[PDB]
Ligand binder design. Sequence first.
Ligand SMILES: [Cl-]
Ligand SMILES: [Cl-]
Ligand SMILES: [Cl-]
Ligand SMILES: [Cl-]
Lengths: 511, 511, 511, 511
Amino acid sequence: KRLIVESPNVKLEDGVLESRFTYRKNHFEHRADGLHVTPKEHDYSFKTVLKPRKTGLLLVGLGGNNGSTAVGSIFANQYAMTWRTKEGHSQANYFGSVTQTATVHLGYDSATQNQIFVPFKDIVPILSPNDLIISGWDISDSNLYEAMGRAKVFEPELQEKLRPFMEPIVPLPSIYYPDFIASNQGDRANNVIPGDNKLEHLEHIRADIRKFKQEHELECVIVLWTANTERYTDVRQGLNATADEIMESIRVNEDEVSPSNIFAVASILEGAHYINGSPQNTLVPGLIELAERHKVFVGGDDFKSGQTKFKSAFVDFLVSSGMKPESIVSYNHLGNNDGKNLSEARQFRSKEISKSSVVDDMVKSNQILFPDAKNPDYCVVIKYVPYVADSKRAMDEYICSIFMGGKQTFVVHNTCEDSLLASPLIYDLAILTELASRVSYKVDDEYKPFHSVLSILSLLLKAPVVPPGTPISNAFMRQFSTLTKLVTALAGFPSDTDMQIEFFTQLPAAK
Amino acid sequence: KRLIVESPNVKLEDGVLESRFTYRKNHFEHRADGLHVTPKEHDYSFKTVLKPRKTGLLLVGLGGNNGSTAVGSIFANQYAMTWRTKEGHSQANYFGSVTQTATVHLGYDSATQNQIFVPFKDIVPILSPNDLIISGWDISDSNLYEAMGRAKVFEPELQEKLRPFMEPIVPLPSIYYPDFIASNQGDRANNVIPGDNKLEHLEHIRADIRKFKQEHELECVIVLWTANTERYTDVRQGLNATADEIMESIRVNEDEVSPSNIFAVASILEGAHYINGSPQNTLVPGLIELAERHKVFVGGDDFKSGQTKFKSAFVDFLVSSGMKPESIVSYNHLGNNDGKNLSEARQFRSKEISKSSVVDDMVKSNQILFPDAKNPDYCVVIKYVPYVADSKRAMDEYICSIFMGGKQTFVVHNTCEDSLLASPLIYDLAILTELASRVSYKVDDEYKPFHSVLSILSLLLKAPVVPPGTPISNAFMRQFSTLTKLVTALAGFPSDTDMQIEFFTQLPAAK
Amino acid sequence: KRLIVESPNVKLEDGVLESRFTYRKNHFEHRADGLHVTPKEHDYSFKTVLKPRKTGLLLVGLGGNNGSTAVGSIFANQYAMTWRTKEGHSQANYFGSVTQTATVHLGYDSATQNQIFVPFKDIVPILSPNDLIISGWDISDSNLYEAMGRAKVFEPELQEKLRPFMEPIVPLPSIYYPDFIASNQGDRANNVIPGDNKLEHLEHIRADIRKFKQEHELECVIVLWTANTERYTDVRQGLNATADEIMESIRVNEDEVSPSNIFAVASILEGAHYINGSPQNTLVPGLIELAERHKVFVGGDDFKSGQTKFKSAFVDFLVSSGMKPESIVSYNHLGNNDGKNLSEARQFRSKEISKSSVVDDMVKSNQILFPDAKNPDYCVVIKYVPYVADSKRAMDEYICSIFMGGKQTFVVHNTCEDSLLASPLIYDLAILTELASRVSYKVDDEYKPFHSVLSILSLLLKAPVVPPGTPISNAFMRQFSTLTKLVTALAGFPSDTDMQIEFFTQLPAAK
Amino acid sequence: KRLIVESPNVKLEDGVLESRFTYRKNHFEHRADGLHVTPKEHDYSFKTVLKPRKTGLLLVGLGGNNGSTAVGSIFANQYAMTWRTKEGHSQANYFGSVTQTATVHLGYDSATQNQIFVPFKDIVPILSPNDLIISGWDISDSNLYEAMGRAKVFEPELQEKLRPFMEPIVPLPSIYYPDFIASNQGDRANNVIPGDNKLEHLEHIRADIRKFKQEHELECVIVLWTANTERYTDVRQGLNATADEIMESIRVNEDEVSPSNIFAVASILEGAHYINGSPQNTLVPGLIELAERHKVFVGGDDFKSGQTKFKSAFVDFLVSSGMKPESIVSYNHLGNNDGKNLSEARQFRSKEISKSSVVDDMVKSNQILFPDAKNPDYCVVIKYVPYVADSKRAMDEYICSIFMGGKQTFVVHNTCEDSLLASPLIYDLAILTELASRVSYKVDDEYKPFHSVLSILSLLLKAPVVPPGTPISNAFMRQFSTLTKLVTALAGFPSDTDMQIEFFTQLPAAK
Ligand SMILES: [Cl-]
Ligand SMILES: [Cl-]
Ligand SMILES: [Cl-]
Ligand SMILES: [Cl-]
């Protein structure tokens, strides 16, 4: 039982689907007497390859909490593993994956007298995480079984069941430049590529990618960073403002060239797409340019898993409701290797910036509430507390001004099983990327892919990188409707079902 | 500086605005091989009177916390009253009014390199709460100054400034049927219409409305219930299933006919619209039918001010994110007259039902998460605690199941200045009603108003009453996009700006 | 390495220890000019049997959450059972037992330059829970293994290890009078003594006790109620004001005679002591009198395990600090059989009263703060929420008035693993009882035991029953110092170590 | 109506009260076979001057939040000032002062059938804060009225009433060494003693003290630091290990000599006592020695006002209950000048250390719970958030291990009106100091005062400084019983009323 489109504007031929969408856009003009709004229409012609390509995913930090869990849970879902609990049994699943478990509203059906909600994955064909082949790299040589014991995410029973699958997996050696992460990671680094020549390093990872692509005969290769937060590099012309600059800096063995820069470069040069799950500024302008030039997609930055995903939806809801956030304070503590890394200042900066950034476009949205567009007091803390381990603790206070100088104070406590929050997002980023790799649209009689910097991934990310000269969009539910309208437009059935006027009017006969 | 539409589909003539909107709706067919989706278009032709009518608002419970505050704050905003605080000064405002302070997204402007957000009130002309003339009724004869001292909402200073405006106002006597509210209200009731003949009562309120409409020469009269929560009436044929039944029950002095039924009837019979701000089931089928027959709008039920407004946006965000709510527990305490009334069981039922109801359409939306469509454990408590007074305290626990049988627990504490939350919503309900009273659309060559049961008011209400045979919609942000798309459609400039594809594509030339 | 007393006031003879303690007590006289305080001394001569007696414990509700856990954990500690966790291993222990894990301050030692803290159990010899032999009764015939699966307290692994010990244990049939508990317990009751003759019931339990005492050759038998909260009986002369009244009511088959009354009677008549772990008013005056007459100890009421244990220490700390509690609101939810029973109103009353009672003696303690001795707003809620199961959730708000009409608000969230909180308290109540059964003191040349109503158990109990005509003492830390001073007085080494004046003075030579 | 002692051990002569107290102390000996405990008695002979001396208090940081509030509230209580609130009126008081509002338990009175609780201030005569004459110094010349507007503690109305009292008060100029506080304080410092000669500075403050003592004819002068947290000085021989060292360092104009060192020195040299309300290490060994030599009392460090006062009582309660704290996380945010100062790292260290220190003596108390005496994970955060101002927000998580490896998690939110918490403590420190200045005891036929380092002030302080070679005592309720036993011993009526054995025994005839 599939979901089948009936439209004069959709044509299947050759296992691709062509889909004409008329886009409604307002155009503006500022005049002495006020703002003139001209609604215009823009016919898009989409083609979508309907068969998902054979897909490999390469994780940097493959042996970490997220990495080993991402891998573990795929196996666990493939074999439908269960484990005993005090309550009975639990079973493997993919909850908290937008792609695997969100449903989408197509409208209302009179016959069944029902709102119609379909699984996201039924709209345009997409991968299941079961279809992802995964390798990658780690500065630690621990196999993915020891890696699970390290992480403390799966209950003991489930680690034992997963043992014959995870244990054989030992990550490839990686680039280690001690100066780009928390100095407390030295002890752990026993699986590193020899030498200090960064171009030999570049070539070594290139070599790693091609063989992976060959050895499994993959048609889509995605590389994704889920290793420790690096510090920021400098950004400047001479170093990394252009593609040719970044390539040259690698050739002459420049210092402000990170391990994460070299992976991004090795990925692009090999036609693999690259996702940045961490706060560092890997996707400098030189990199984006290099991706534009090589026809590959980039994404980032920084998983939006817990306290910020909430912040994202809550500050939107509050400004939409006519309420002025005055004070936002966000404490966090955790005891995993992620926290021990963010013990150090330059790494905590990477993360502080990306956590602090998500209420900018909202404060700018509303000049009644915010006449001077001044952000509210906004404070972001992360602390390393070994005891709670992977169970991060998000403690937040929101203070708003409401009607007649009254106040409304929300205090919040949020238990975030970080790895269990993060992994599904790793599956979604990979999955939406392969899908985007299958979409094209008419530019001028030839078909073109979307921009390289694939901002539609924003709902998954804290600090979204976006095509040059366009606005950042931080409010989660808004980022979700971008995604769900897009796939319905691809599939042939977008609508105005956010305003079901049929319910309070008599519905005009169809044209 | 107004907001000016430029469209071949919009025409001003005679101070009304005609607006053709093409509505995108999916139509469904269930077949052996799956679900067939046919996108169709429905041309709506709207007319919107552009000058807001002269508008009176009549509140039942005029002397209560909400009532006296609603009135107080209008005056306070008219005269721009300030009061000293430890911090400096505060000034009157209308924060927490969607209509007065929400902004709306029309799109992106290249020249200014900017997202375009306009005040809701700039899209189609609507009232300001300053333009509302307000009277009403109260079983307590206390003037609106003593009423402010009672309520304990405005700081002392602001009650003194408001004294020469509020003090002269003494509410009209009301219908009091002791058996429909908390028996603890007996002491307070010293301003009641004599007798036990309910038809004489009906006539007395009718008399009250006409004179108000006459005495201020009003073109729109809205009646709104913000008195104490009554218990539910029985519902059955013979009593109140039809209009003729409800009229007859009033004539023969039936018992299961509430004070709130008589107001609703007095309102409709006089061409005034009627809003129910409380949990009771005033708008029984007989009443809706009577409103349909008299060409008046009804609305309800129960202000969605605090803990439920949040619940509404948060459970949506969580199911959209691929997360299964397992347990929702909602405690509440307050010390105002609202709480003292909800001390009693039949009144607490009214409210419990409407608070508990808001996660039904969401659990039905997602059959991956909820295969058997079974709501999570859901518990709603309200307690009378004199000390906190109007400062209600909402304490909530949400427990969700996420990826791989992991859990995510959110604990929440929410300081809700109920009256300061509620009043702005009283201004919004009135205001959207008068606006709807100005909209018509083409049915079959003649123009018709929307359905009497005006469900577009849902964002303001906990337990929305909706046109017979159509689904309830509980998720706040979804209710807001219904409203903002509608007014943009009226004004001439609706769009697909929830998916700004211009940012990752080359924008096709306009057609 | 024992703890050895060196005193002219202590004598061992025959395995009992004689201990003379000089008690400092103020005596008062009210006069026109004020309050006259006369300090006097009272020499107590204690004898303490030093060898703990062979001890059986009989639980009513043996198959419940507390019961099966109490039993499980004894076995688990006897065999030093471990279970795997994500973190490593956990091992059996007795944490949260005052007797097994509190330490006591005897003073400061110059040689080691150290505060001297010894285990409570080192002061006077007391049982270990490993030395307790346990049987009892349950209306449910489920064996203690099925009983563990029911309760959901121990992790699966630990239930399997405990299986060959718990599985053979099937509780004796009990008295079931449907009318004294939540009607929702009918289904569960398949293990009941036949008939409606309450005197035959009385005799049947008597029979149960003697055989237990015989079959294990016990020198101390304690009976303890940890079955479902019953409602309150009436209290009146004719029924249960005296011992002879209560015996007669059982003979004539009176209705207001509870199952818990019959156990208390069967216990006393057989020389077993009786502890009431639940809210019901089992220990009516007739019962106390019967215990006085039979030389047995009674105790109750209601385990002080979680939210009330905290409340107890926090309200004391706050009134001692010069702070006026103004508002205390205490929400609770749980999903165990305890909660499902407290779903019903008469059972929730039992518990509401005992939870609400703990700030009386403190508000009376301070007439500066509380001139009119009026308790603050105090609200206690319990809700049945299946999902959280045994993991009760205590949500509290304390609002105090402080300096200059300022306010201080504490909001609290407390995860209470009820069974894990309760069981250790079952071990402490039994253990302090057997100890008290070993203490006597000089009345008038013959040695006497303490009063039957053993109030020293108060630290463990919410609603302490106390010898007639004496004050209730609710503040936990105060209840703890009663206990620790007493055992040091017994052992020979009490002190003024709450005021170690040696540290800021030159210490006078010993006398 | 006074409180009148009746004892053969108490004698009034010449307005002093002589009081013989027999102190019960255990003495220890470690032997092969175990611990031998020898209870001994130590007769103390106290003399207490009964008339409180005429008392001046000099505050450093007189113009701060605490300072201006401390002064404001004295006036406010002298004149019984009220202010309007939404609720009615509030009146001046001294809540949150232990000395002014704690009550003390002397025992039980049979005639009235009552526990006897008396005000602390009724036991031995002590000052009322109304009797304190207050001046001091501030680097800011703002008068105490502008100082109130700055602080934002009193409601506007109360600042106006206090205006003619506070406005005339302009603090004396102070020592400003920019390098000892947050560099962000430069702007504020417009009231400073000229020059960089620290000995001239020393002399200038000496001059300030003598004239204050002269001008009001004071018999007790107390100097108290409540200015901004300085950083720590170095500590070493050569600099400040001895009195002669510290005097010399001032003479030769040494750098590591703080402004707070010079005040402490100016105080001692003038026979004024000195209290340190802040985290810095003012009372280095050289200073204590100088106080010992000059027969003056010192106290510190750091007001224990809010989150730490609670921590202090809660960790005690939890270890006494047999519970292992595993994780303590303490977040704090505030927007006052205190927070803006603790923005900077060296100042935040001062405070972090003193907040983190309070669970040491408790973890050492219990080797069952803590076999290896390893403190739990313990994290202390302070953040500068302008918006909340003086309303600091304490957010805490306590995680304990309980019975059978179960866990208990307490999450806490605490609204701390810092200035309203702090000031009463300023009144208590001064007040207990003047009282101690009136107590002496027999050393060897002559009477001596207590040690200079007056540790009995500990209940008021976070990081108590104590006589060399004696243990720190951190648990609040324990610190309170030290104080209340001491004053009852002074007054003639100490007791064993923490164990009222009369209630479960027959009370032996008095000896
Ligand atoms: Cl799934
Ligand atoms: Cl406004
Ligand atoms: Cl143990
Ligand atoms: Cl007072």
